[PDB]
Every structure is written in structure tokens, then in C-alpha cells.
């Protein structure tokens, strides 16, 4: 629980919360549709290589959205301990 960036603003294998959508962006109801809904957790598998789109795990399975859904979800970062760099 902290003032929540977009899912956008995380990087690999990271694990965040969704706190909330940004409405009305019509993407909301997409993100919605998908599955996801405030409270869901959200494992990022890894991003494409052009940086867009990402690999996401939630809900119970692997798909990838794109960096823009990405931009509408609001998310809380969850994992915190000492962050592999290699």
C-alpha cells in the first residue's frame, strides 16, 4: 500500500499489486475483461525486446499486455529485499 505507479514503470520478474485502474479509459474495461481486478497480484515474466509489449503472469496464467494497459493500471510495489543485478 503506497502511492501506486503504472505497471508500466516496473521492470522483470518483479511482483506489484494492482490497487487500481485509471476509468472511463475505455482500456479499463479491457484490463477488466482480462481478468484483472483490484487486488489482483501481478508477476511481470519479461518484457519484449523492443521494450513493448510485456510478459505478465496474473489471474492463473502467462499472457502478454501491452506496455499502454500497462499505462492504465496503477500498481503497488510488493517486493522489497536486495535486488539480483546480475
Do not use: C, F, Q, W
Amino acid at each position: 500500500m503506497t502511492k501506486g505507479i503504472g505497471l508500466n514503470e516496473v521492470e522483470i520478474k518483479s511482483k506489484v499489486k494492482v490497487i487500481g485502474i485509471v476509468p472511463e479509459s475505455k482500456v479499463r474495461r479491457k484490463i477488466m475483461d482480462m481478468g484483472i481486478v483490484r487486488g489482483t497480484e501481478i508477476y511481470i515474466e519479461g518484457k519484449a525486446p523492443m521494450g513493448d509489449p510485456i510478459a505478465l503472469r496474473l489471474r492463473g496464467y502467462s499472457l502478454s499486455l501491452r506496455k499502454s494497459e500497462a499505462k492504465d493500471i496503477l500498481v503497488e510495489v510488493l517486493l522489497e529485499h536486495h535486488h539480483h543485478h546480475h
